[PDB]
Amino acid sequence: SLALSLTADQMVSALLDAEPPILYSEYDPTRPFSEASMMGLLTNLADRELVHMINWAKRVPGFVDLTLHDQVHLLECAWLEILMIGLVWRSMEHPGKLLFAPNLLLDRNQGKCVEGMVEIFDMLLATSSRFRMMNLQGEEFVCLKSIILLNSGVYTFSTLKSLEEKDHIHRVLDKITDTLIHLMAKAGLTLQQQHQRLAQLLLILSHIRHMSNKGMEHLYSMKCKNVVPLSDLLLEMLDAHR
């Protein structure tokens, strides 16, 4: 298809070109935050980011080739992982802080305004500290983010033709793997340093999955508690994870 014939530098350029924008929040520094107000800004922010992510997913090489129900499944399972790694990525050059928006840069002390948030806050910070220590590159970021979209839901899909579409997902994933190796070779990394860094990057996705699962329970805790109003799309993505 389109993604299979695509080269490494063309894979990178397609992903780099499909990046969603950085959005601003309605945050007013004149007033101090509360649990309801802070959680209202983050929920409003994620809801708007969700819209851009869905159209970003449509531009990931291979995602169009899938059926609409398979596209829904991957996004239903990966949406918070993708929001989180994007948050971690743009927070990379702000140690000890999470850049939710250019006008919203929070400490872990401010994250205490929301119950249970500080645990997920520290996990997001440690991941961003890990990206900084690894000096993660933007070309590697877009590859990892596309891997999350294609991988996080592929093990919850029994036709042989079902197999054919699933084997297509593994075919695109193998291509993105080749693209990551292609990038590391250009940076002057030895073959040993290439496999090692590839392992380090993919092992972070395990922790990102963990953050998303812990984050999924935190959002479901506030849907029933009704502490902050959740948008219609977010409540729909939340019921996918039950």
């Binding site: 819209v51 869905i54 159209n55 449509k58 609409l68 596209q71 829904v72 996004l75 239903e76 219609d232 799309l233 729909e236 993505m237």
Partner: peptide, 10 residues
């Protein structure tokens, strides 16, 4: 399904 609608936007 809002996700299904947003995905099926032409």
């Amino acid at each position: 399904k809002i996700l299904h609608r947003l995905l099926q936007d032409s």
